Amino acid sequence: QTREVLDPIVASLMEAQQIPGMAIALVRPEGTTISHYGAADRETGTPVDDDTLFEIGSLSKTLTATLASLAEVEGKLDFDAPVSRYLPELEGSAFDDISGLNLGTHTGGGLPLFVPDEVTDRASLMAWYREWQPTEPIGESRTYSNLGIGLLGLETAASLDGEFVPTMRAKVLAPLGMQDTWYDVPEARMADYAMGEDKDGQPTRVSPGVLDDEAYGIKTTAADLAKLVRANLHLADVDAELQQAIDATRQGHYRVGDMTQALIWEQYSLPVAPETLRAGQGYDMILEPNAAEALEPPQSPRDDVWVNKTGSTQGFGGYIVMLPGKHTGLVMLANKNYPNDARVEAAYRILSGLGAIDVP
Numbered sequence: 001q002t003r004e005v006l007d008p009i010v011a012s013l014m015e016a017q018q019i020p021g022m023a024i025a026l027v028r029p030e031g032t033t034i035s036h037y038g039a040a041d042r043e044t045g046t047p048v049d050d051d052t053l054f055e056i057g058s059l060s061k062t063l064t065a066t067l068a069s070l071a072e073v074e075g076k077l078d079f080d081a082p083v084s085r086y087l088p089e090l091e092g093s094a095f096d097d098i099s100g101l102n103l104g105t106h107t108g109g110g111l112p113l114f115v116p117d118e119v120t121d122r123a124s125l126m127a128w129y130r131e132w133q134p135t136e137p138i139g140e141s142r143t144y145s146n147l148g149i150g151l152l153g154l155e156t157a158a159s160l161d162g163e164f165v166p167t168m169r170a171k172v173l174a175p176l177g178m179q180d181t182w183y184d185v186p187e188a189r190m191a192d193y194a195m196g197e198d199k200d201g202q203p204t205r206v207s208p209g210v211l212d213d214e215a216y217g218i219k220t221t222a223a224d225l226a227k228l229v230r231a232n233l234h235l236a237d238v239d240a241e242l243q244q245a246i247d248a249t250r251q252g253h254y255r256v257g258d259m260t261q262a263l264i265w266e267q268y269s270l271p272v273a274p275e276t277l278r279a280g281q282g283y284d285m286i287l288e289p290n291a292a293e294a295l296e297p298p299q300s301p302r303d304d305v306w307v308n309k310t311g312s313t314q315g316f317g318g319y320i321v322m323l324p325g326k327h328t329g330l331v332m333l334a335n336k337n338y339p340n341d342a343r344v345e346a347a348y349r350i351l352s353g354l355g356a357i358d359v360p
């Protein structure tokens, strides 16, 4: 069925990229199919199964965006308000001029990609933010940023008067049934935690760091991520306010060349050429500032787009695609950090093989 389309493509991908193991969820009206392939740990040979936890890296940012949006729906967070309204410890800094929306769209004045080495804890982070000078025009330039989405997580937690992880668990993960999603893998689930494999074929596992939870720290299953995808596709039964929060994450906020930046989610109008998708995952988009043009008609979520997000760690590579117009979504998790171009190709081939897209 689905599996006759999916299986050969996955086999071929895993051989070409030497990926030890994958977990794949396909979400459609009719239901969700979960598929597991290969080994959770190349060394031990333990097979990937329903309980296997993968590092999803920057896919975590989709949850951060979702909680931020829920705080907004509840009236606790104003997305266009200055960040310093909610983190008064930043009053007088550039965060008087940068909003939560800027942070969720990577338009926060050139805020850099990585947490600097000199930042080692919350106190040193906040002092770094206080001193930092914007290098790009706020709201007019996109620079993909862990610091930015991390600060949105801090802003959101403050607006909700809660700690980020337990608040995420209670307000987003639990209501979505995401019970195999972890920021810190419990000791009792360590046997289920896949071992990563880096580009050099060496075992690797992510280390804690500043803003890890907010930016890149989730370990989860494909099935759990599929619940988030299901809700984004209007295929879940969830709380009205949570559904509203989720839908708002797909509002288009900035045009960035061919790409539309929503709240973390990135999207393209259909039909889309794979080369366009590849360009979205390349050096020029990810590692340079790109001019960004605000959409203040904030675009209502669209039904004729390819919505996506990549995420990686040193040892893992994930990709989510949604096609809201076809009520179809795809989650691909691997315990190898394999090239984004191959993620794009595999996803396109799967979705086209399933009839959810046309090629030429």
Ligand SMILES: [Ca+2]
Residues within 6 Å of the ligand: 078, 079, 080, 081
């Ligand atoms: Ca406002």
Ligand SMILES: [Ca+2]
Residues within 6 Å of the ligand: 114, 115, 116, 117
């Ligand atoms: Ca560093």
Ligand SMILES: [Ca+2]
Residues within 6 Å of the ligand: 209, 211, 212, 213
């Ligand atoms: Ca942390």
Ligand SMILES: [Ca+2]
Residues within 6 Å of the ligand: 345
């Ligand atoms: Ca090819």
Ligand SMILES: [Cs+]
Residues within 6 Å of the ligand: 178, 179, 180, 181, 182
């Ligand atoms: Cs959990």
